[PDB]
Amino acid sequence: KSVKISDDISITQLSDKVYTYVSLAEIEGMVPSNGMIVINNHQAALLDTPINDAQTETLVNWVADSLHAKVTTFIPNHWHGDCIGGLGYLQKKGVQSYANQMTIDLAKEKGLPVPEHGFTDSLTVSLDGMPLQCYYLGGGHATDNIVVWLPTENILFGGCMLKDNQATSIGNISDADVTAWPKTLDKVKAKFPSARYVVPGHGDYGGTELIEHTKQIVNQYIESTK
Numbered sequence: 001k002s003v004k005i006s007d008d009i010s011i012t013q014l015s016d017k018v019y020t021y022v023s024l025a026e027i028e029g030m031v032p033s034n035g036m037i038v039i040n041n042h043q044a045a046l047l048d049t050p051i052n053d054a055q056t057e058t059l060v061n062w063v064a065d066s067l068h069a070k071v072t073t074f075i076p077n078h079w080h081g082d083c084i085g086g087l088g089y090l091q092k093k094g095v096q097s098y099a100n101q102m103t104i105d106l107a108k109e110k111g112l113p114v115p116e117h118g119f120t121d122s123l124t125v126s127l128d129g130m131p132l133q134c135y136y137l138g139g140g141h142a143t144d145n146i147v148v149w150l151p152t153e154n155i156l157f158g159g160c161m162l163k164d165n166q167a168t169s170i171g172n173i174s175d176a177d178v179t180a181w182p183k184t185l186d187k188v189k190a191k192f193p194s195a196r197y198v199v200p201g202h203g204d205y206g207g208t209e210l211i212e213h214t215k216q217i218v219n220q221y222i223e224s225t226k
């Protein structure tokens with residue numbers, strides 16, 4: 001059940017420990033972005049932030065006030081705004097961040113907020129006992145794009161690397177590695193055959209079919225461009 005927690009942010013529960021939110025932002029489009037909120041021992045991990053500090057603040061305050069958990073952790077999918085737009089506020093709030101080194105480096109050269117701990121292959125952050133496993137399986141939608149697996153929950157936040165079942169466009173391929181994209185998706189499917197829920201960057205979530213679907217979109221793109 002979708003729960004509007006603001007006129008722009010709405011949250012939806014997938015399990016007792018996991019929630020996926022959608023924040024909307026006018027830009028391009030009044031586009032909607034997805035992210036997660038993983039809770040344990042009154043500790044929250046925000047996975048991706050809303051387009052900015054304002055939205056981010058609203059969400060974090062809702063997690064506290066409503067979910068009765070304090071966001072102490074943050075992991076961005078990659079350096080794009082719908083991933084780290086609210087990192088500044090979080091840092092202001094004292095949040096520990098982890099991200100692919102690639103992301104850290106890009107945000108850096110981009111004068112963008114910088115996640116503070118950087119990993120290169122894979123990493124597991126124990127959200128007070130709860131494992132949040134991050135993996136860099138290759139380039140996709142963005143060169144630095146990662147996925148975060150919640151083993152205990154069997155939930156994959158594949159991020160902006162996966163498209164919802166209704167999607168039909170490859171999207172912004174400005175920072176994408178098109179040719180790598182299909183192989184990454186291959187590694188992802190193979191790596192999480194147990195995905196109960198697969199959550200993408202924009203749109204509704206589903207199951208592992210989101211992987212094969214995104215891969216259909218990309219391969220077709222690669223063919224359209226004979």
Ligand SMILES: [Hg+2]
Pocket residue numbers: 048077078080082083159160201
């Ligand atoms: Hg993202």
Ligand code: NA
Pocket residue numbers: 033034035047048049050082083
């Ligand atoms: Na997001």
Ligand SMILES: [Zn+2]
Pocket residue numbers: 078080141142160
């Ligand atoms: Zn992006």
